[PDB]
Write a protein that binds this ligand. Structure first.
Ligand SMILES: Nc1ncnc2c1ncn2[C@@H]1O[C@@H](COP(=O)(O)OP(=O)(O)OP(O)(O)=S)[C@H](O)[C@H]1O
Ligand SMILES: Nc1ncnc2c1ncn2[C@H]1O[C@@H](COP(=O)(O)OP(=O)(O)OP(O)(O)=S)[C@H](O)[C@H]1O
Ligand SMILES: Nc1ncnc2c1ncn2[C@H]1O[C@@H](COP(=O)(O)OP(=O)(O)OP(O)(O)=S)[C@H](O)[C@H]1O
Ligand SMILES: Nc1ncnc2c1ncn2[C@H]1O[C@H](COP(=O)(O)OP(=O)(O)O)[C@H](O)[C@H]1O
Ligand SMILES: Nc1ncnc2c1ncn2[C@H]1O[C@H](COP(=O)(O)OP(=O)(O)O)[C@H](O)[C@H]1O
Lengths: 578, 232, 578, 346
């Protein structure tokens, strides 16, 4: 069966297979299963990059080395070679004869074990359509009799659809859960192969570089497991140095080369692997002030709370933090959240609580076993916090949330996790919860009764106390007030809009001068203490655009030209042609 | 039938099938059904892991050993592999040709019994595509004549979801309830089967170890029935 | 047709088919259809197992035997095997050719009829592909013109779901409804078929056995047509007797054997009642009195209902009995029911009424309607009853269910049936229904106000009467009001609890002796009229079990030991030793 | 119809009855095709119908008017003076419990020899369960089941349709019957139409019973017989009621009736005993005693079955099960005067 299956003891005998590093109990569990009289076929269930193949290889390695129980005893694990069974013929006639001959020889051989790598891929048609579409049917009865012990290989999602598909195999194979190695284990596997990588690329890696490949990859690779990505970083640093005129002089690969390599894929660490674990944040109070003008104490308060969380003050199961942002609309509450997420290098996740106002929508957000989105949404909230674990979560206008939302959030605040309808869990230990609400200032908008009107200003913090429960308040890191905007700020806002208009006019070729009185006026007219600067979008969208758009379109105006609008004494846009 | 069915009597002679321990009542009923002139097609309905398959196999074993009334003498109970029967077709006349050939090789006997596990798979027309002509519609006319005796096997849940809907197939089978053995019975089952565990493993089990395996499985293992888990 | 159809006259001539008995009008109409100028194709439609096929083949039998009108004389009826018609038709044209050839041979016979069983199956006759020409559309024109005559056969369900849609085809057939036979007709059918069974099984049947088989099946077997239902009883009884002379117990079949066979399905024989089962019933009252102290009325009500039903003085269709047990807590209301099921050896079905606290929860008992989530999940009450027809049904807390649920019971108590969401009927005639309640208790605990403390004690019944609507209330066999337990009862209660402890300790290898004084002490210490018997279990856990737990658990008292308890009269404390 | 009448007439010659095809043959053929009875009304069925009213009076005592209402609706339909497109009749029986409201319907179906289609309206207490009568809309899960009501009426076109305890169905379910009662049809989920022109629709209710039995406050007891005026009117929408043929009130059972009821139940007991080989005789005095003892105006005939169960069936069950009265004996029940207790024997 030299062209039907690969002898893996023999492969291990000729290099091929490295000793397995870690997952010793997985190798032993497979042995414990192989030793059973029925339902004695182990299955390795993993995913690429966590050692699922390496374990099967490790079993063969142990055998060639004699590192086996006498209960084995002189076995010989072979890997089904679906390629070789098909190759050279591509027809059922010979695939079938070769496959059946393979099984007959394996059934006949003392203690032969057949490892089928990627067993979840022969579920379709054997190696390929035209080959043994019934390979599974031939295997079912030999497994049932125990003629050939078979070692399976599937992935976590493939198992549930491949073995559970047919009881003739589900009831024969035992499931072994294979998970990834740790940071130091990843370093050990790199160090295990390090001599090869160094030989292969004519480079040398520092101890720090190897650790950095692992320690940094977990912050940037995100989706694929670490064991391979840290290695890809080591191979890319090596390969890059060998290709580029580097390793011929600078054989050594340092952490900086690892940072450059991870950045080649993530584009982060070469500029941002770690600038100021404390200062990029303290500088944020001032960085935010460059875009958000006002609410200075609010941004400083957030900065202090984040700095405290980073100090390690808290618990291992808790979120980074939770804040309620109270105040008028149009004062930059969302602007602060956005600028913080950018500065901190994280994603912003957003939900509008007014859309989670009714009981049904509440279950869709949660991913409650019933009443969830799709089949595994779930859980709009759980998904968002699984895909982006270090993100900032913004919940808008929170007083409009249905009470069940309010309670799921309290449960998350207490334990750091949210369970999906499919049993999967979101990890909130790395996120910041930002909750907003425009209720604390609505009372002061009221006009009183009486011959003399009075001042209806209130303490917005007391209004928050009445609206929200104390269980909720006691779990917040803070309540932060974002106040109304000053005159110079509304000027900064109107100028930002005017500048964008000018950029668009520059693209066309028209120059627009806006007098200072007009700039002030638009800012004062658009701004409404209750809605802040929110309405500024329209005071400009119509006043500085409609009258100009029309001339260009009518044809009196051309691509070039210089137009000014001055505010006159009647507050009427004093426009000119061009 | 050459690559579709297994002669279970031949297997019982080779080694094959384990003897049944304590299932005489189920066997008495299976014989009562097979000995009828019409609809002599027992169906074993149970839960997985309760000896539901073991019983049908057990009958073949008993026939081989001469542990049956002479009425059953010389009968052969071959097990049918649906997978190999349906795989490898894709043409219009394939399912009607292969199946009929199988039946002819059973029809020619008078003492042949067919054992079909996963009987409810056949229900719903089995591997039939495009408009009736299901294996069911090939089978009904035979069951009605008594030409082929069929022993079925399924579970309670599958039994009610497939059968008793296609009513004509419900009245053509005789249902037998296969329950789950008690703790004491499970111990008896382990001890009768025990010599092969000891032989495979080169171990010896104590009396306490056997009873404990059953009692501990009852107390702590809750996803299945005893003939499977205590043994496991 | 040489390898596709059977000339049925061939079977009629060699005894290959059983004779047709009766069905004069069915055959009368079928002939008139065949005698029509156009579309002369009768179709037999009916319930399964009523002889539809028997009639169609029965005609071939009658033609051969000369039992038909000259018109039919010398006609041939052929039976078609559809599977053999498709088998092997690989390649376009083979299927169209075989089919056409068959029809041509029939068209040229001119004096023959084609009979098709499962005529629904030809509806989507083999389809090559996009082209829809199938055994059916092509096989039309001939039915219309009168060139050929066919006989159809299908069930009511297949007829309505299958073809009951192809109008062009359906209009070419005349539908004849085949109904189920009467009792007298069924007996005659059995008498004429009987000699085949007598011969097959080497048996003879008495006249009484035949009448019993038909009438008993009608009374006790619910899911089948009566004729197929009577035949099945006779054949099983035959087979039962056939397996007697294996030890040479040769005998004929009589009523007692028929009764045993039907009883196998009904679960209550009418004959064993006269044997040792007379003592099982005779002693029922005492086996239970030894377990439940006092409350003889409950024991008698249950015991007598069972005896009448077994005696044969039943209710035709009502349940074995229906009782409401009402009273103070801790007095054995559910305890007696549980013990009854044990004493009788039958399943106890328990439902907790507190889980059906809302009107809509009723779908949980009987199933969701078609089209609604959970439709195919079942219905808990009807499944339990169908699966276990001989049982004790206990509904705990009959007052904690939403009141609308009582309306389901009205139908069951009065008629013996409940229908599920698939139209199947649960049969409760062999069920003992017990409902428990403490509804009238609080009302009699009420204190009066005034100088002349007026008496109450009628309120127990007045409260019950205003809870259950009269149509429910008068549909019960009885209402048993339970009393409080007295101290004499407690002495008996303590004795049974001590015995349970002794058994529990015997299992650990330790015996226990308790003196009379120790028992009297516990009885007085524990008795509380207000809470019934239940609290005696607590006085025992603290006085006997806790001391033992420490001696047994930490080694001073071990398997092989004995322990003794007595009252120390000076201390009014129990002693312990071993 | 013409081709079949021809083919049929052509076989009349088997007995040599050669003839011209005339309307009478056409009517017979249409009637056979559609499964609708018609010509036999002229035959022995005249007596089956003529004596229907009396045969039922041997089963239900009192309630003569209910029997007359049912009997007449049937005779008109058979006579030919029926309606053009309505059920044979639509009745709503009402009254105190245990008075034969559902029993008379059952016995009618037996007396006439036709199927009883019986539905329990207590199972349709939710709105969405109306789908069980009609079937799911296309594209849904239960689509292939069909409706249960439309389905039963197609298989058995000539039948008595009984809907028990109609007041317990969710009221929207009543809307289905508006087209049934007025137009004779109902359409299922595949577009097939059930045709009710040959069935008798009987609905029974307890509406108003709890109220009619209530005691008033005052010196003069009030007459609470007008429950029809409140509960029936409040439950059934005007359009429902205006389509009914008759609302028939069953009465309470008077003493004379009870005596007949007791005799009826004794006969049922005698039949069960004959089947076990023993027989029972009862003295008239004993019967008068049982009737008086068991009598309760408030629950109709229901309790009479219990006075018999305790005074006759229970004693016998012990005699039958423990050997005193088994094969070889007979039992005589008589009343003494001293305790007014019953005798037994062999
Ligand atoms: N009048 C009769 N005379 C003799 N045998 C009868 C008569 N009526 C019914 N039978 C019995 O009916 C046969 C079963 O017949 P059918 O009901 O016609 O089969 P079926 O139509 O194929 O039932 P399906 O496939 O479940 S719908 C039994 O073998 C007959 O003995
Ligand atoms: N009269 C009795 N004779 C013998 N055992 C009894 C008696 N009463 C109660 N028991 C025992 O049965 C249990 C308590 O009575 P139960 O019948 O189970 O309670 P219940 O009446 O059904 O329900 P509630 O909640 O008390 S109303 C305990 O195991 C014992 O107290
Ligand atoms: N007037 C009567 N004459 C003869 N038998 C009667 C009469 N009334 C009742 N029955 C019997 O009819 C059976 C009970 O059925 P029904 O009286 O129809 O109950 P009901 O009147 O329909 O009232 P519901 O539905 O229980 S509230 C019993 O056998 C007897 O009560
Ligand atoms: N420092 C600032 N403060 C307030 N608004 C600003 C600022 N800079 C730009 N804007 C603009 O943001 C506003 C919208 O603010 P946002 O917080 O996103 O929603 P909302 O106004 O409803 O609170 C207007 O588009 C415009 O005033
Ligand atoms: N009474 C018995 N005597 C001998 N072997 C038995 C007996 N009962 C069960 N078995 C055997 O069957 C057990 C599991 O039940 P099985 O019939 O295989 O479930 P299933 O039919 O669902 O596949 C074990 O494989 C084996 O012990």
């Amino acid at each position: 069966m030299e062209n039907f299956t690969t002898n893996l003891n023999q492969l291990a005998r000729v290099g091929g297979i490295d000793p397995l590093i870690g997952r010793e109990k997985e190798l032993e569990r497979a042995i414990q299963v192989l030793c059973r009289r029925r339902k004695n076929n182990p299955l390795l269930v993993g995913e690429s990059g966590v050692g699922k193949t390496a374990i099967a290889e490790g079993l063969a390695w142990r055998i060639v080395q004699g590192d086996v129980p006498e209960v084995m005893a002189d076995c010989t694990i072979y890997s089904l070679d679906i390629g070789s069974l098909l190759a050279g013929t591509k027809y059922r006639g010979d695939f079938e004869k070769r496959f059946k001959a393979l099984l007959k020889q394996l059934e006949q051989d003392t203690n032969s074990i057949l490892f089928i790598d990627e067993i979840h891929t022969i579920i379709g048609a054997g190696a390929a359509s035209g080959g043994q579409v019934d390979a599974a049917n031939l295997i079912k009865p030999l497994l049932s009799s125990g003629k050939i012990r078979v070692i399976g290989s599937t992935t976590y999602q493939e198992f549930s659809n491949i073995f559970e598909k047919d009881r003739a195999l589900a009831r024969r194979f035992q499931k072994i859960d294979i998970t990834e190695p740790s940071i130091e284990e990843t370093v050990q596997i790199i160090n295990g192969l390090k001599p090869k990588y160094e030989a292969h690329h004519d480079v040398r890696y520092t101890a720090k570089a190897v650790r950095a490949a692992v320690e940094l990859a977990v912050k940037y690779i995100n989706d694929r497991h670490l064991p391979d990505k840290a290695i890809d970083v080591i191979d890319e640093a090596g390969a890059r140095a060998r290709l580029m005129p580097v390793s011929k002089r600078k054989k050594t690969v340092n952490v900086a080369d690892i940072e450059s390599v991870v950045a080649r894929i993530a584009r982060i660490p070469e500029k941002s692997v770690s600038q100021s674990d404390r200062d990029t944040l303290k500088n944020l109070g001032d960085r935010l002030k460059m875009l958000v003008f006002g609410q200075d104490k609010a941004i400083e308060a957030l900065t202090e709370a984040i700095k405290m969380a980073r100090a390690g003050l808290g618990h291992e199961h808790k979120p980074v933090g939770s804040f309620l942002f109270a105040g008028p609309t149009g004062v930059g509450k969302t602007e602060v959240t956005v600028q913080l997420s950018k500065a901190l290098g994280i994603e912003l996740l957003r939900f509008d609580m007014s859309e989670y106002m009714e009981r049904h929508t509440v279950s869709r957000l949660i991913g409650a076993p019933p009443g969830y989105v799709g089949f595994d949404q779930g859980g709009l909230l759980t998904d968002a916090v699984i895909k982006h674990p270090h993100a900032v979560l913004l919940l808008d206008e929170i007083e409009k949330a249905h009470p069940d939302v309010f309670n799921i959030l309290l449960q998350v605040m207490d334990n750091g996790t949210l369970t999906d309808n499919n049993g999967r869990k979101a990890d909130f230990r790395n996120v910041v919860l930002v909750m907003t609400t425009n209720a604390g200032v609505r009372e002061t908008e009221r006009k009183s009764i009486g011959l003399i009107h009075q001042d209806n200003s209130t303490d917005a913090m007391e209004e928050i106390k009445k609206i929200f429960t104390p269980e909720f308040r006691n779990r917040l890191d803070n309540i932060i007030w974002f106040d109304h905007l000053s005159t110079d700020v509304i000027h900064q806002v109107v100028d930002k809009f005017i500048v964008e208009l000018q950029v668009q006019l520059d693209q066309k070729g028209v120059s627009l001068e806006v007098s200072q009185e007009a700039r002030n006026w638009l800012a004062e007219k658009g701004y409404d203490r209750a809605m802040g600067a929110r309405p500024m979008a329209r005071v400009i969208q119509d006043n500085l655009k409609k009258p100009l758009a029309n001339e260009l379109l009518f044809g009196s105006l051309v691509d070039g030209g210089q137009v000014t609008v001055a505010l006159d004494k009647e507050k009427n846009e004093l426009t000119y042609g061009f």
